[model samples]
Target: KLPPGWEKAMSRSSGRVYYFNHITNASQWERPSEPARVRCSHLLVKHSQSRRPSSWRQEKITRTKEEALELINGYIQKIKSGEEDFESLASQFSDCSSAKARGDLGAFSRGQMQKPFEDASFALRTGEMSGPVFTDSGIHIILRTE
Candidate 1:
């Protein structure tokens, strides 16, 4: 939910939601909140240290921890720069087969995912994205589509 006097709705022209404050008459993007059962997407890159080193993207997985870091950074860079969208990047680069739906991880709760992944994900709001997170699976960048 938004602050007092603020409201939001989906816009037809952009095919995305728009925000406004009825009292202040302002449009902006910065906001934060958290809740249970968040819907999300993620792009994961695995390193040799991962519990499962093999992936759909790299069956013979051979990347190092450092390499995984670089890769995640690149993907996040593209996302932040608007160079590429999350769905496309996740579909093309994520090691997890959930990328089959362009990184869709479905709705999940506190205990469902790796603990750190949950922390990174639960910290997000609708239409928000995270930086990098580490887990036994490797590094992941989270997008809470809500």
Candidate 2:
């Protein structure tokens, strides 16, 4: 069930939580209930290239409506299918520097991330995967192993 003002973005099932694509401007499910606000940048990746952010990279699209659901979903699938190792895959596949720590997006409240990504990542049950969804960068497959 989505919170007030949230919209569907994507979905999948993996013998566990029914993955969903929740697109929204503000996250209404954060702890302590903080106001919604987040900032994000644009990035791009080519096939066969490690998915980490690097200098000399390319700018794709700016996320204005918090519509990065595909990236998260693709991230989750890779991790769950064992096609990639958690830490290694995240480090190589994630665009964030924290991917160095294995895509550890860290605990964040509502609006901490672009609304769409945050809502799905936060709402995911411990140890589940999401995606095939697309974000500004590329496809993502997030795994929630906590």
TM-scores of all predicted structures: 0.76, 0.47
Stretches of candidate 1 above 4 Å error?
Answer: 1-34
Give one digit per residue, the lDDT tens place, for model 2 in 1-146.
55433444332433332323343222112221122322222222223232432323234434322344444445445655777665665566555555656656555567455544665556455554444334444444555555
C-alpha lDDT of all candidate models, in order: 0.80, 0.44
- Cα displacement (angstroms), candidate 2, residue 70, comes to 10
Which candidate has the top score in TM-score?
1
Off by over 4 Å in 2: 1-78
lDDT tens digits, residue span 102-138, model 1: 9999998989888878776766657867767888999
The prediction achieving the highest lDDT against the true structure is 1
**Lowest summed-lDDT stretch of 10 residues in model 1?**
23-32
